[PDB]
Amino acid sequence: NESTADILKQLPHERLQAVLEKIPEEDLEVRRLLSILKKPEVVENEDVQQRRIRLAEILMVDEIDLENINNDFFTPATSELIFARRFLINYSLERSRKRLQKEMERHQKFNTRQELLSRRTELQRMANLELAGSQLVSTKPISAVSLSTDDMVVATGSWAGDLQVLNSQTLQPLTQKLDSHVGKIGAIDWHPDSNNQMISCAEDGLIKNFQYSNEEGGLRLLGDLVGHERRISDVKYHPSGKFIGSASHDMTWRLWDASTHQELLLQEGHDKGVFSLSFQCDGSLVCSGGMDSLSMLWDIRSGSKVMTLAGHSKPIYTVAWSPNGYQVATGGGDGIINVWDIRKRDEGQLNQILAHRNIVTQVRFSKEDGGKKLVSCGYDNLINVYSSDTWLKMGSLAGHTDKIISLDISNNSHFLVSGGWDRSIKLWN
């Protein structure tokens, strides 16, 4: 009787088939052992009975044992930067005081009728707008366009990362082009005062301070900024005028001086990329949007993380501050715009415009008038107009054949300039 059973037992199929019945039977139970045993949890096509067999086949070959045996700091330093914080406080505090006073003064007049006429007029104006021309720039999509404080000149950055400055009204052709040392352009910004300088961030982790010379095409590097490893997505000038803050990919937004070209603050706190930095009009606060879907406010003067905003279930590309200074607006991969006003805090918080399909790139408030309208751009090819009171969508405009990387709007609000995957720059009325 022994020799009969032994030869049967010695056999590989039989040896397997005995082992198959001692292993539990559920999809989950089977699966867990696999991942623990490191082999692929699932294969191409299989029913669980086929899955179960694989276990056995793996358990057999290695002669492995049964599932039984199977199973915050404060950082010191940089006194010199410390000096600046004082400057900010003196500048910030005064500015805030002035702003609040001005806001209050508006309140007194009331006379609702005028206002409610005004909004209607604005909406009608928005409804009308159309293309003026297109134009061209390069053969890579256009990553950033910006208007000077006098609104006479546009700068256009390609992915190729070469910037040509164009003439607002006509656009035709341009003043003069430069192919900068960098290949993929993040953002381009004007100094608020002189109209003599720009700043541009790009793939190489180097920010370049440009001197724009008169009507000359002799755009001249004033200095380069170093310290950044990864690509730099966004860069801005403090509302003040002295300081430039940089925000890139390695979880470091860096506050920089214009004059000395020094690193005033190295800040941390997001856990993935940080795709935008915005500075808020009293020059008190910077809000950082990130790829981790956490909008995080920051007080420059104390260097304290203040209020974390959670609302975006995909990366937050643009963070647009409002002129009034008590509201912010964000946009993201999720096709939402959140608008958070810090004053309410306990129960007002975020009003979500549902704006766009297919992402959002750059949200812009209207500069003059304290901020009323919103303008935003996604890959939906459309472009939107929003009230800042109801946040009802008012109108949309389609002149682009492709997606839109970024857009900036005339200070008066008689221009809208939008630039596009399609490689043109389209002036909107």
Binding site: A310, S313, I353, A355
Partner: protein, 205 residues
């Protein structure tokens, strides 16, 4: 080892003639027709049996699938649609089925009866795409139908009625528990309806 029957030959109406296995070959000619012809069908019957038995087993197995309970997705794809009229019942019915058919969470609303309205749907991204296809390309909202009233049947011309999508996107959580078609008389309780869901904004004037 002798645990198992020694196999007998397969036989067919081709192989039939030259198998001289001891069983009534030339002797009983029609008795050997039946054996092979019966034999052939018994093999086939087995093919049919393996099929039906397997077919039946899966349906029981299916019930375990029925029992399995969702396991939340981390992100919820969503859509939103907006139309002039929903009056046609055939349209009212499909929207109830497919929503229950595909496990789409969500809601629908509108103004009174003839007043326009909105649709909301949420699920895994595969589900929405089906439903989106339905609402736009399959169903004709401009089509005409003869409705039934309490008295009798009357024509309706919906040609002016039209549909278009507003947004598709992504949301931290979908507070919609089930898909609940309803009616609101005003534009306000309509908001308060969505208001319960913190969805007031999804309506566009």
């Amino acid at each position: 080892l002798g645990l198992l029957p020694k196999p007998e030959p397969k036989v067919k109406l081709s192989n039939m003639m030259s198998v001289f296995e001891n069983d009534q070959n030339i002797t009983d000619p029609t008795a050997w027709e039946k054996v092979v012809k019966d034999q052939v069908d018994l093999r086939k019957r087995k093919h049919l049996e393996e099929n039906e038995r397997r077919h039946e087993d899966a349906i029981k197995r299916r019930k375990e699938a029925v029992n399995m309970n969702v396991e939340k997705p981390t992100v919820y794809h969503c859509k939103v649609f907006q139309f002039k009229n929903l009056q046609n019942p055939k349209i009212r019915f499909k929207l109830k089925m497919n929503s229950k058919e595909l496990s789409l969470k969500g809601l629908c609303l509108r103004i009174r009866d003839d007043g326009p309205g909105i649709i909301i749907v949420v699920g895994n991204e595969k589900s929405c795409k089906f439903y989106e296809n339905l609402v736009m390309k399959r169903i004709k909202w401009n089509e005409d139908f003869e409705l039934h009233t309490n008295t009798g049947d009357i024509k309706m011309d919906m040609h002016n009625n039209s549909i278009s999508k507003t947004w598709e996107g992504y949301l931290q959580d979908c507070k919609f528990k089930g898909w609940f078609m309803k009616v609101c008389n005003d534009q306000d309780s309509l908001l308060r309806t969505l208001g319960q869901f913190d969805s007031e904004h999804f309506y566009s004037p």
